[PDB]
Write a protein that binds this DNA or RNA. Structure first.
Ligand SMILES: [Mg+2]
Length: 190
RNA sequence: UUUUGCGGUUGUCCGACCGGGCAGUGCCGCGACGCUACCAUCUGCUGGAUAAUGGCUGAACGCCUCUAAGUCAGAAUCCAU
């Protein structure tokens, strides 16, 4: 069954500027500006009433309608990113070997680089390069905790997952060796 | 090992024992050049795209979740250098 009209709406705060050239969405806010490309989905944008952006798909077969709500949340994530930002907390879990971590901003590229030494007995050094626009800090309030911050949820979430995926145990019972860096709550900066 | 290079030596033949001939390379020791042996010596690089799999954002299906749109890492795999 094809649907003659599917519609989603998104509230835009008054302190945020939203621009859609063709389908490339540019969001400018207090914390900076974010750009997202959506030229792979057939969707129409419009202004409904004084600060709300309407999204509609006109003839969808339940596989295009599904992508309608996905776009709405992605655009809403851009608005949230430039207003309240995204902050991920990650805790260190180990049994015998403390995990030694150092963070440093590369001067040539500008991206933070997370360097992990002393995994479970390991001598190898695990270097993870963060996505652009993500800031990495070691929390002082609580011991053994990383903090990743940035406007882009894709950048922050992918960066946190790269750290977790590189700290995987090999050839051991993973139900016993519960060692690694695992993502804690996923709140906002503000 | 036909360098038939030098030396040794056996049986005949060359007329006085120097130098050689023949025994299909007479036999033995050493033998340079050349050829040659994991029997000797030297040398044999790195992008990119992926598969399984583990993930991010995220609907369908107000909850969720690696997938549906998008996307990350990744094998002696495929392609190329
Ligand atoms: Mg999810």
């Amino acid at each position: 069954m094809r649907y003659i009209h599917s519609e989603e709406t998104l509230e835009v705060p008054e302190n945020v500027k939203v621009s859609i050239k063709s389908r490339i969405v540019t969001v400018e806010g207090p914390r900076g500006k974010l750009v997202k490309d959506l030229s792979h989905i057939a969707v129409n944008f419009s202004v409904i009433k004084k600060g709300v952006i309407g999204l509609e798909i006109h003839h969808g077969n339940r596989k295009n309608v599904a992508a309608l709500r996905t776009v709405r949340t992605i655009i809403n994530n851009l608005i949230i990113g430039v207003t309240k930002g995204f902050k991920y907390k990650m805790r260190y879990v180990y049994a015998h070997f403390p995990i030694n971590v150092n963070v440093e901003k590369n001067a040539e590229t500008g991206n933070f680089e997370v360097e992990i030494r002393n995994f479970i007995g390991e001598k190898i050094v695990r270097r993870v390069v963060m996505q652009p626009g993500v800031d990495v800090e070691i929390s002082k309030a609580q011991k053994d905790e990383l903090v990743l911050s940035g406007n882009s949820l894709e950048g922050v979430s992918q960066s946190a997952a790269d750290i977790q995926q590189i700290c995987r145990v090999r050839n051991k019972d993973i139900r016993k060796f519960l060692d690694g860096i695992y993502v804690s709550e996923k709140g906002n900066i503000v």
